[PDB]
Design a protein around this nucleic acid. Structure first.
Ligand SMILES: [Zn+2]
Ligand SMILES: [Zn+2]
Ligand SMILES: [Zn+2]
Ligand SMILES: [Zn+2]
Lengths: 63, 1480
RNA sequence: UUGAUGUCACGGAACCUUUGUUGUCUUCGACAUGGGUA
């Protein structure tokens, strides 16, 4: 399940650290690859918590 | 001298060409250049530039001439006329300078020594070779030597691969340029011959030139003597002017689909209600208008031009969207010819990919004239493959080296076949394919691709020539041709999906003997009958039939027939055809085209890809070198089974069915959730048929393990577990049987207690015969919702989970209505009839699915599956903090207001004021008054009671005009005073100079004018401000005479069409002369009453106070204007309407006049008029617990959410953190397939109608019945305020009663008056109680508690019932469900009966409920109370209240006086959540 | 645009792998509308 790890990365993330940036990029890439190749990880049907903060952080990252 | 000889070449086929190379690379070391030397060259004028033309080198022609000369020499005797013609020299010691060397076997006729290297005379052959320039071959260029831009102008490149016989997959390939012969057939050159050459050598040269038959890889005969880009930019700019950007790919696909005919643009689909507002074709100028203009343009009228235009439009839009041995043989030789036709029995696919066409992944091969092609390379490869299969020996050869000597190669070095093309030239069709994720049961991420396919029925010409030393054709070739004639010819690619089956028809053959002299000299004269006239002459000398081989080996593939029985609707999706078909539906079935002559023929069928996927999935779930790989192939090996499209026997025509989603809270249709689909009809009475076949190798058939796997899978498919098609959740694609013929019973061999009663109900409800109850209440949910993170996958039959069938029976307790909405004029006044299919009364499975889901979600405390989260609520104000102001970044403020008459016959402000200042653009100077003085000449002997002295002047028409110096000289003023009896009679004779006392009172009087009236010329300031004209808007129209209009004298006046020229007719209070009222007359309205005569005037404008505007206030104002604009109950005449609704204002603008309320810093709300609406700041989804909202819902928080579009992680912001609730786990969601399937219901006995029909001889049709009005549900009644204490109550449920008796009688249920026919009400055909229906439910991988709770929700208890159909508030549609049988599955072979486990399942369900909620179960009791069915000797009275009590003859209350009573805003929720609460 | 005593390139199938599928009861009652009086 990469969703929990992404949640952990996000809640701990701060954008001044290239370490944090590369860790979050790796987690998102790991989730993307698991989405492309079919596997048992696709049965995880949940989402993230703290929607406003998560939206702000994701928008800041992908932009 | 050196007399020459002109030559020419006429190409009968496309020829090949080599690309240009740099000078230094043209050497023996380069591999590609050495691989050339047999194809045509390309010229370059300048080395950097690509300009030039093709040409052919003379050395190649010299080699061909030499080869033919040797062939003739070994053939006849080696004697040209009478000379020996020595074998010649082909060896030298200096092999370093040559570029190529001979690798074939040189031929032999004599055993003598070759002639000396230097001698007196040479033989004719040695003269032909030369070795002393006796003969000089010239290069051949073209007629006239034109020039071309580059090689791509005359030809196109193509890829040619080499396969492995063991597996059937390619591993290497090479490229080449191909040039069509219809465009460049002729070449010319010359040959130089010296005078010393012998006449025998000349005759040999002539014979050899006539004998040469192939050059540059083609047959030859030798003889000697703008709007697209513009329209694309227009359409793209239009889509960008809108925000319809997601539809670009779909639009490009539809445009490319339109290429077939321009007439399809005229017959394009439109939107519902007959209006041109399609969500694709009317995005705008509009796309439809543009396509019509491009269609009717003259230059694009041409068919081919239209086709090219459409293809270029599609390409542009898709781009934007993405953005030496010397061995003898002998003199024996024969030449055998075979002719025939190769007809296509299925579609075919010859792959050929173009670099400048990216939209389609897989493309077919075509000529520059758009004709289909059958390449020589493919025919040769298939012949080689069949020969290798016949000999059962692969050829282990390699490129280069000496020639091979195996039987296949020896047979293949005698073969010649001709390239072919067809007359049919219509465009190819397109097919779409997907990949399914086996875990979730939905498509994978990004697994979509296209495929181009050619139609079936095309006929090609066929010609094959064999040259060998045998008496006739080899036995292997005879057997291969017999296989091809039978229909075992698989030529094209994609054979697994059923492409490329051809048959050979009308075969003829003849043998020629080129050993006989006369026959040889006749062959040479006629050039071998290669040209068209020679071919016709040869065809006049051909015998029919074909030979018969001795050693006949049977074919390798065996046919297996298939027949399927289907008793339900079927559909196979095709969105593009739905996007261009004229029917106007959301989903359409699949249809293919058969090529007959030059015209197509539509036919519906089932896709071979879909069938293959279904069978593969069935095989893989009950069981690299694994079985699946071995049988179905993989990416490293070819398959061993080939499917085909299945067709229907007696061609059906599609129907249409409509659907709608119901909101759980309001109980009405959810917005933007109305859709329909077009399946083929099917039913048990006249089921559908399917026919087809599939092919399988014999080796697989002779394998017991593979036959066992196939038999198991087909048995599972036969036992209703795997439906065919889509939308299986609502009873589509239910297979009933499946046959398999033509296998010798190798695969077909494997394919071959009563229920307990319900428990009684303990629920009790007290009903009194005098009170009146409400027709619906609510059920309050629980606080906790259980969610599981890992649902059960679909990849296997898990152990510990159950699978099988459930059979039920449905009974009607009250009359039922289920209409057929295809026809709305069965009997303006709409009419409907009962649902039917092939003249059989039925109920669709979607209705039953929704009905059962509504109760299951209540039993298992789950989320609100269907709910409009983004709706915003509004409420009317009632007659303080709203202050005037003007708009921008901040808003201005005013301190006070004042009224200005505009609709009375006293002021006449229209004659004076300008239009701009009426609109409020310019300032105006007006005259405000704040207080008025009211005398009473005698002492009160009032509330304030001031004092003074009056000074009489005169007495006018009655009245009393006089100046009054109050407080003994302090203040003075004039006025008019009426006679007050008991005080006025003291002064009836006036003196004109007499003074009397007076007491004055003050009253608030805030008005403004521009010229002071005649009555009050004193005490009037002059201040500046703006005006707020809104027009006549206060109006009170109704059905008939009220009370004020009843007192009107005479006929009321006419209507003015303008909003300015209205004036008052009559005052309401005639005595006091106040409350002006206006009335007017129109044709059918006849009743308008306007009670407004003053406007508003602001003043005291300030400059300091400034308040920022928020976006929340902005969106609230937008919703306010939308609510004003969309009002069904609006007054008809626009003159009686406010400005915002008359002029149709949409957005806020600067400089407008509006009221507002503010906090310390920002503004909170804005309204256009004094008494207006209030709009909630929060959406309806935020007024409920987060655990009750849908698991996969919509965005409610502040944010566009569009920045994260086109990224993967955006989907995680719309899902709950804790997973899925039980309802979404069972019934499925948008990214998870369900585990239950419902089926269509059918009536068992003969129908029983509510009203007898007009014809006694037609018992299958019933009479009509008229219903009352049916209006929308209103959330505002349940949520009567904006305060945070109000929340969503719960799920709505309707109660059971017998109000339908009054409607059947014909009277209104509430008032008892007769029902009025009108365009608004409806007429329906209804069935009576006592009828019975039967249906079936199928589940898969369910737990004990899930199955038990499902059975409970089906058959709850005795004394309870469900609600089905329409008119539920009137008592229609109470039904009861009882279970009949419960089958189960153990293995593929055994299916037991599970009727003796229902008590255990029910107990486990109750235990799970107890262990989820610790024995509270209040919602359970509430639900059981609401589902209670009244028993005998109990007739509750249930109906809605009227708007007012005067409209109710029964004397019961109405809504207006009920709001100020029991149902006030503080206890409304409590009184609505309690079931069976009386209100009268 | 060729060399000359040597050309099996008709000496080589663009081939092989992927279900247009998933989720939705043709359903239904409380208003609308801005002022007026002193
Ligand atoms: Zn010689
Ligand atoms: Zn070989
Ligand atoms: Zn495998
Ligand atoms: Zn849910």
């Amino acid at each position: 399940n990469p969703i929990r790890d992404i949640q952990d990365r996000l809640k701990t993330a701060k954008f001044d650290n290239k370490d944090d940036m590369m860790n979050l990029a790796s987690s998102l890439y790991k989730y993307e690859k698991q989405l492309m190749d079919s596997s048992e990880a696709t049965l995880c049907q949940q989402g993230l918590s703290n929607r406003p903060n998560s939206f702000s952080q994701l928008s800041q990252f992908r932009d | 001298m050196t007399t020459t000889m002109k030559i020419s070449i006429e190409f009968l086929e496309p020829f090949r060409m080599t690309k240009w190379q740099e000078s230094t690379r043209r050497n023996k070391n380069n591999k590609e250049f050495v691989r050339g030397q047999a194809f045509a060259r390309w010229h370059r004028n300048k080395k950097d530039n690509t300009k030039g033309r093709p040409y052919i080198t003379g050395t190649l022609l010299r080699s061909a001439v030499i080869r033919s000369a040797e062939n003739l020499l070994t053939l006849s005797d080696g004697k040209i006329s009478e000379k020996t013609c020595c074998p010649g020299k082909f060896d030298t010691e200096d092999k370093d300078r040559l570029l190529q060397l001979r690798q074939r076997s040189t031929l032999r006729w004599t055993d003598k020594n070759p002639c000396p290297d230097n001698a007196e005379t040479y033989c004719p052959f040695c003269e032909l070779l030369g070795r002393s320039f006796r003969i000089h071959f010239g290069n051949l260029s073209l007629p006239g030597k034109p020039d071309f831009d580059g090689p791509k102008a005359i030809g196109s490149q193509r890829v040619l691969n080499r396969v492995d016989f063991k597996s059937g997959k390619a591993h290497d390939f090479f490229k080449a340029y191909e040039v069509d012969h219809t465009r460049f057939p002729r070449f010319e050159g010359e040959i130089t011959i010296d005078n010393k050459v012998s006449a025998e050598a000349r005759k040999l040269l002539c014979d050899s030139l006539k004998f040469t038959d192939r050059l540059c890889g083609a047959l030859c005969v030798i003889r000697f003597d703008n709007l697209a880009e513009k329209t694309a930019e227009q359409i793209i700019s239009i889509l960008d002017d809108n925000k319809k950007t997601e539809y670009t790919r779909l639009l490009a696909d539809a445009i490319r689909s339109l290429r077939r005919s321009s007439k399809l643009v005229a017959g394009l689909p439109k939107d519902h209600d007959g209006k041109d507002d399609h969500y694709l074709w009317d995005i705008g100028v509009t796309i439809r208008q543009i396509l019509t203009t491009s269609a009717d343009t003259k230059e694009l009228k041409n068919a081919g031009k239209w086709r090219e235009f459409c293809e270029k439009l599609g390409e542009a839009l898709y781009l934007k969207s993405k953005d030496s041995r010397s061995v003898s043989i002998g003199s024996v030789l024969k030449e055998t010819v075979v002719c025939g036709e190769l007809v296509a029995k299925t579609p075919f696919f010859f792959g050929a990919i173009d670099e400048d066409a990216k939209q389609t992944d897989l493309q077919v091969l075509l000529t520059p004239d758009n004709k289909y092609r059958l390449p020589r390379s493919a025919v040769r490869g298939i012949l080689r493959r069949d020969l290798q299969t016949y000999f059962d020996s692969p050829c282990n050869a390699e490129l280069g080296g000496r020639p091979c000597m195996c039987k296949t190669c020896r047979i293949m070095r005698g073969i010649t076949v001709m390239d072919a093309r067809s007359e049919y030239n219509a465009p190819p069709e397109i097919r779409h394919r997907t990949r399914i994720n086996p875990f979730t049961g939905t498509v994978a991420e990004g697994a979509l691709f296209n495929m181009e396919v050619a139609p079936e029925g095309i006929v090609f010409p066929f010609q094959l020539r064999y040259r060998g030393s045998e008496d006739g054709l080899p036995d292997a070739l005879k057997t291969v041709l017999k296989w091809w004639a039978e229909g075992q010819a698989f030529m094209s690619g994609a054979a697994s999906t059923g492409k490329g089956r051809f048959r050979m028809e009308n075969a003829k053959y003849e043998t020629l003997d080129l050993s006989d002299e006369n026959q040889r000299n006749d062959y040479l004269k006629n050039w071998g009958w290669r040209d068209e006239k020679g071919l016709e002459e040869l065809k006049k000398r051909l015998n029919s039939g074909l030979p018969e081989p001795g050693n006949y080996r049977d074919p390798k593939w065996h046919e297996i027939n298939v027949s399927i029985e289907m008793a339900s609707p079927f559909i196979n999706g095709d969105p593009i055809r739905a996007a261009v078909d004229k029917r106007g539906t959301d989903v359409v079935t699949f249809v293919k085209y058969k090529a007959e002559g030059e015209e197509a023929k539509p036919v519906c069928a089932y896709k071979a890809e879909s069938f293959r996927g279904v069978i593969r999935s069935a095989v893989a779930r009950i069981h690299c070198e694994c079985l699946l790989c071995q049988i179905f192939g993989s990416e490293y090996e070819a398959g061993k089974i080939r499917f085909e499209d299945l067709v229907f026997e007696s061609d059906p025509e599609p129907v249409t069915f409509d659907h709608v989603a119901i909101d759980r809270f309001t109980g009405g249709a959810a917005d933007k959730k109305k859709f329909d689909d077009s399946p083929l009809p099917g039913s048990p009475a006249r089921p559908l048929m399917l026919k087809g076949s599939f092919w399988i190798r014999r080796d697989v058939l002779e394998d017991e393990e593979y036959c066992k796997a196939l038999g198991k899978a087909l048995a599972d498919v036969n036992n209703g577990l795997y439906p065919l098609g889509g939308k299986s959740a609502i009873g589509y694609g239910q297979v009933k049987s499946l046959g398999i013929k033509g296998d010798d019973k190798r695969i077909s061999r494997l394919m071959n207690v009563a229920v307990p009663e319900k428990p009684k109900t303990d629920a009790e409800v007290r009903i009194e015969a005098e009170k009146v109850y409400y027709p619906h209440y609510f059920v309050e949910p629980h606080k906790k919702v259980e969610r599981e993170e890992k649902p059960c996958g679909h990849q296997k039959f898990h152990e510990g989970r159950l699978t099988g069938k459930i059979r039920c029976k449905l009974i009607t307790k009250t009359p039922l209505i289920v209409p057929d909405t295809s026809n709305d004029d069965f009997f303006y006044h709409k009419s409907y009839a009962f649902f039917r299919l092939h003249k059989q009364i039925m109920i669709p499975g979607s209705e039953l699915r929704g009905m059962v889901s509504s109760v299951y979600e209540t039993v298992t405390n789950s989320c609100f599956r269907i709910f409009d989260e983004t709706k915003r609520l509004s409420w009317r104000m009632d007659a303080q903090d709203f202050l005037p102001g003007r708009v921008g970044k901040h808003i201005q403020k005013f301190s006070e207001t004042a009224r200005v008459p505009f609709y009375d016959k006293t002021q006449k402000h229209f004659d004076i004021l300008d239009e701009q200042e009426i609109a409020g653009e310019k300032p105006v100077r007006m005259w405000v008054k704040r207080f008025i003085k009211r005398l009473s000449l005698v002492d009160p002997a009032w509330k304030r009671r001031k004092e003074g002295i009056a000074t009489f002047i005169e007495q006018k028409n009655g009245s009393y005009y006089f100046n009054v110096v109050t407080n003994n000289g302090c203040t003075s003023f004039h006025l008019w005073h009426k006679p007050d009896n008991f005080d006025q009679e003291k002064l009836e004779g006036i003196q004109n100079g007499e003074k009397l006392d007076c007491w004055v009172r003050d009253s608030r009087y805030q008005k403004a004018f521009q010229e002071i009236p005649e009555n009050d010329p004193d005490g009037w300031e002059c201040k500046e401000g703006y005006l707020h004209v809104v027009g006549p808007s206060k109006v009170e129209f109704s059905d008939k005479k009220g009370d004020v209009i009843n007192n009107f004298q005479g006929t009321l006046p006419s209507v003015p069409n303008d909003w300015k020229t209205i004036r008052t007719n009559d005052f309401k209070n005639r005595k006091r002369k106040n409350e002006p009222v206006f009335c007017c007359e129109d044709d059918k309205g006849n009743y308008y009453t306007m009670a407004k005569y003053c406007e508003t005037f602001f003043f005291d404008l300030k400059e300091n106070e400034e308040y920022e505007i928020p976006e929340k206030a902005r969106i609230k104002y937008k919703e306010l204007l939308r609510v004003y604009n969309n009002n069904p109950q609006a007054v008809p005449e626009s003159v009686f309407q406010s400005r915002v609704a008359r002029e149709n204002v949409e957005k806020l603008k600067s400089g407008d006049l509006v009221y507002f309320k503010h906090n310390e810093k920002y503004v909170e709300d804005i309204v256009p008029v004094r008494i207006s609406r209030t709009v909630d700041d929060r959406m309806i989804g935020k007024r409920m617990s987060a655990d009750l909202r849908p698991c996969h819902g919509d965005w409610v928080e502040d944010g566009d959410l569009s920045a994260l579009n086109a990224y993967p992680e955006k989907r995680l912001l719309l899902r709950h953190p804790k997973g899925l609730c039980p309802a979404c786990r069972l019934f499925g969601t948008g990214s998870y397939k369900g585990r239950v399937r419902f089926g269509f219901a059918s009536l068992e006995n003969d129908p029983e109608w509510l009203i007898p029909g007009k014809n006694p001889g037609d018992p299958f049709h019933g009479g009509p019945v008229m219903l009352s009005l049916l209006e929308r549900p209103r959330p505002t009644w349940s949520i009567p305020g904006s305060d945070n204490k109000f929340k969503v109550p719960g799920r709505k449920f309707y109660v059971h009663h017998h109000a339908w008796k009054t409607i059947k009688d014909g009277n209104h249920p509430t008032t008892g008056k007769a029902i009025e026919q009108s365009p608004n009400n409806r007429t329906v055909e209804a069935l009576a109680g006592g009828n019975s229906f039967s249906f079936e439910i199928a589940f898969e991988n369910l737990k004990e508690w899930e199955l038990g709770l499902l059975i409970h929700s089906l058959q709850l208890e005795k004394g309870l019932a469900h609600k089905l159909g329409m008119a539920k508030s009137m008592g229609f549609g109470s039904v009861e469900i009882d279970v009949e049988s419960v089958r189960l599955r153990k293995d593929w072979k055994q299916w037991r009966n599970g009727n003796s486990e229902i008590p255990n399942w029910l107990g486990k369900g109750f235990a799970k409920l107890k262990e989820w909620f610790r024995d509270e179960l209040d919602f359970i009791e509430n639900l059981k109370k609401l589902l209670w069915f009244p028993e005998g000797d109990q007739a509750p009275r249930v109906c809605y209240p009227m708007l007012r009590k005067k409209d109710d003859p029964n004397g019961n209350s109405g809504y207006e006086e009920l709001k100020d009573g029991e149902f006030k805003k503080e206890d409304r929720q409590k009184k609505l959540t309690t079931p069976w609460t009386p209100w009268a």
